[PDB]
Subunit: 310 residues, 4 copies
């Protein structure tokens, strides 16, 4: 199986690295405006492969995405000193109007996997531009945060993260929604499991966990200037779900008909991921306070969209 | 890490095979009354190891269980033509009174993992005989059936089995309880997920799934005379949980203070499994009809116990 | 990819179990003259898959073989205490005369992988009956003995087994030839390297190792009645080689035009194994004594074949 | 087991990422002069672990190294466009003069694994400063070039890379020596085997391959400014070797008493790597020309060391 990556920067190369080390696909093609950057990365990683799995990593052009089952969109421009967040965005939407036609013309059956920040806005742009069914354009969204959430709860509960079912929904960023109300652990409600364990879960415990999840990205960016190891591996996992037609449940961003009262917007909700992308959406139970944050989250996004032409 | 297996028959050797192929432990010691059977098995499997993982598989005696972190009890005698189920049992309880002291004298810190059928009665015998804390003696119980249950639901729902949380509780056998009432899929109740999918789940669907789970063991036994591949791999998974202090949730059999109104009995309930065995029990929600079957199940067992001296 | 297995006893079933546990193929079809046996093994194995890899194991007829990339031929008769080498051969030959045509009708394009003892002569009849090109029919042959030979030499020298290059060639059995003369370790002559590590191989060392290798199968059979755990994993490796078009080097059995003067006979030589079966032979340096041993080995196999009419 | 990493830039961080993704160790501690960088990389990586293996990645000080079985030394200075080979060396030497003492105070019993360029001279200073026995300080050296050499030869011959035995020796850099003369494939002389497959290595073939190997790092650096993806996985393999006491053969750098007449210098030779670090050397056959190339290589490294006072 072949997999493509457009934008061979930290995020794109880190995704290629994770795919290689995990032996997810047998072939990975990197594409970038800076051809020598993409070649340098391909060969750097190729140097790794004999110490992991046989994976053919190379750099090429769009035409070389031919036969790819999924193409990661990790392309984007560098933030200018004194530039708004609103113009950085516009520029990237411009990059994407260039990239999407060129991807789908070479690889008309590929699922599109959006990585470039802000993931939800960029996921919408990509959906509009593709003209494909809504399930074919998937954004990484809040997967990392959902896993962080579960990890912290598992830590607190002295249990395996695998038995913790909790979600982070909505906008990947500071307004994302941690779904405390309906999270389960070992098939039973969070709080009941917590107390049959000697660990109520004080409002102060919840604040610590919410910070742990909510501000991770920010702390990472503050310390090294950008995130990529995490998403690299998250994306690899999503590619795996696609290639193996896994139909596993993931909090990923996609174009939604409606959510919490808002129409036609891309945000994270637990979705069934497989061969053709996302075929089906789970709708977890929300507290009034939780769904109010979700719609407010949905509000912000869907207006950012229109106000960019998408 | 070292792991021991007492009873090097189909079940014990198949467990050793699964441990080897999966590279769960670095060393596996087999023990059997028939020394040459155990040696033959160890070396047969050792022939396999270069095609999987470096695992030192050998045959020895009880003293050779020294340093084992877990010891599988897969020992048992062959059914006699014209013998009751009640006397086959008695004989095995006799085998176990021999085996348990000898295991724990060589390996005083090992977790005991019971395999020999009937698992719940044999798990009780082993608990009584050990004199160890209740969490140190774990039976495979209904793990296979819990996984079968989840697999069939996942099949029906066109979803990944990993997102299906459902339990089979109680007595490993024809009176086991499939917990339909409170099963979840992707963190939401089974039936709500089923309908937001176009698949109500008719009483006829439930009957098909219940047969699929309930009678698998019987069909297998009917066709080749005994089950071992399944439990082999199930046991390997339990050994893994122990060795990695995973604290993962498994429907395994253990001595319980109380369950559905019955006191001091070994049966399957979802339990946290780790370094010292099982440290904690989940209590899933049950329908009135479900808990009535659980107690009736508990009834049968706990009397089989006393009536055997354990 | 689909793998077929014809002959679902201990050899065929362990193979399928090993395929499942290692996640070599997505689908494994079991075929046996005893239909309920195959079905029982299939369900027993399917019970294990949740504890390893998503693998679809099921039992069916010869037609259910359609599209299989490789077919393991493990069908044969129950041994009879007292019967000769040649008597058993006559019976299994009789079996392949039924099985082979049926496989090729259903999956003409499958690589045939022969496992049934004596594997060298059985490979010879599978090949003659198949009318396939010579590389598309391959017996497991001597692979387990080659691997044990490397392991014992690695133990003696205190190095990883992967560092050791040595072969056992010819008949899978008493006459097989350990190639001491040109054995390498980390790319250098074994004797030289052994002496450099300050440990020249005494005749007694050589003697103990030969025994360890050549008489392994004998001990397993005396102790438990048959071998299967070993070959199951070796066979799974061979299947993997074929599915992934590895072009790996394996001492497997195949029809060979001439060897040490003996003409048109099937035995193990190091061969390159990939998607079409074998496609290339490696000729290690044989001392004069080893060539004579090989010649003698080939002559034994050639006479056995001739008496059956092959 | 705990692995330490000192120097948490692109080389140190990819290493940790590769350790995490491959599940080599349970704990990886990151140490950097820039504390928020290390913390950021640690959290970025921790974000990936749910999509791979339970690995605890965190950032701390030198004391947090206590109990580490191996420590990766990847600390160094930012390159300066225009600076010489010797200038950069002087700066990194200065760095190890601070780092080394601090590591040995905290984890005296850790195998030191050197990564910082130029790795051969840096290994030399780590060794002299450490006062450790010679095998307990090991540089990554030439491993990536050895592996690329095998891959290109395997591609040319159309065989699996595992079948190919060949080494690159000496300086990790321009003077490194590809050992054509005694290269083996499947245990036989490469030239002979190449000709047997009907494909003798033309001078142009040899020429293209040398280039492919020797100038890989150069291209990666021109295209993206530094190498790290490759060495990260190579280093993770070396750590694995040490943690598991593999006694595997690797072309890694270490202090060597004499080589081709050059005395007391660190360079890559094939070495046996296990729990104490390296403990044995393998001496491949060098043609007269290769010996001269090696001699020349060793002399270059020895002069560089001497000018720093080592
Ligand atoms: N139109 C485009 N097509 C492909 N790659 C692009 C395009 N525009 C920018 N890039 C690359 O996207 C990458 C973003 O890097 P990073 O933000 O570090 O992941 C950079 O390597 C850019 O060269
Ligand atoms: N006291 C005992 N200690 C160890 N192994 C035993 C004992 N009694 C019976 N066994 C073995 O337990 C195995 C049960 O085989 P199976 O029922 O096929 O798993 C047989 O191989 C017996 O030899
Ligand atoms: N003509 C045949 N077609 C298919 N399977 C067969 C045939 N003859 C024997 N077998 C099976 O081959 C298997 C041999 O088992 P084992 O020798 O234990 O690997 C048994 O399960 C037999 O039923
Ligand atoms: N004395 C030191 N102790 C610890 N880390 C250091 C020291 N000097 C430099 N480093 C780090 O070494 C790393 C080199 O990064 P790179 O060359 O990209 O692998 C940088 O993160 C530096 O901060």
């Amino acid at each position: 199986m072949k997999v493509g990556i457009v934008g061979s920067g930290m995020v794109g190369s880190a995704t290629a690295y994770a795919l290689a080390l995990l032996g997810v696909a047998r072939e990975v093609v990197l594409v970038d405006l800076d051809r020598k950057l993409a070649q340098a990365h391909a060969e750097d990683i190729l140097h790794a492969t004999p110490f992991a799995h046989p994976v053919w990593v190379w750099a090429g052009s769009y035409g070389d995405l031919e036969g790819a089952r999924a193409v990661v969109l990790a392309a984007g421009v560098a933030q200018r000193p004194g530039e708004t967040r609103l113009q950085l965005l516009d520029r990237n939407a411009q990059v994407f109007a260039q990239v999407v036609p060129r991807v789908l013309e070479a690889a008309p059956e590929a699922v599109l996997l959006v990585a470039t920040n802000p993931v939800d806005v960029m996921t919408q742009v990509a959906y509009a531009l593709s003209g494909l069914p809504p399930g074919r354009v998937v954004g990484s969204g809040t997967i990392l945060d959902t896993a962080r959430f579960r990890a912290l709860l598992a830590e607190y509960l002295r249990v395996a993260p695998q038995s913790v079912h909790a979600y982070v929904l909505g906008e990947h960023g500071d307004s994302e929604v941690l779904v405390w109300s309906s999270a389960q652990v070992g098939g039973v409600p969070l709080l009941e499991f917590a107390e049959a364990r000697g660990r109520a879960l004080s409002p102060e415990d919840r604040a610590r966990i919410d910070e742990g999840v909510r501000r991770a990205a920010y702390r990472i960016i503050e310390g090294k200037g950008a995130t990529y190891y995490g998403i690299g591996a998250g994306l690899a996992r999503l590619v795996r779900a696609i290639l193996t037609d896994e139909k596993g449940v993931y909090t990923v961003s996609a174009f939604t008909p409606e959510v919490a009262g808002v129409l036609e917007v891309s945000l994270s909700l637990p979705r069934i991921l497989g061969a053709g992308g996302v075929a089906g959406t789970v709708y977890p139970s929300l507290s009034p306070e939780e769904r109010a944050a979700l719609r407010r989250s949905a509000e912000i996004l869907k207006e950012a969209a229109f106000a960019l032409g998408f």
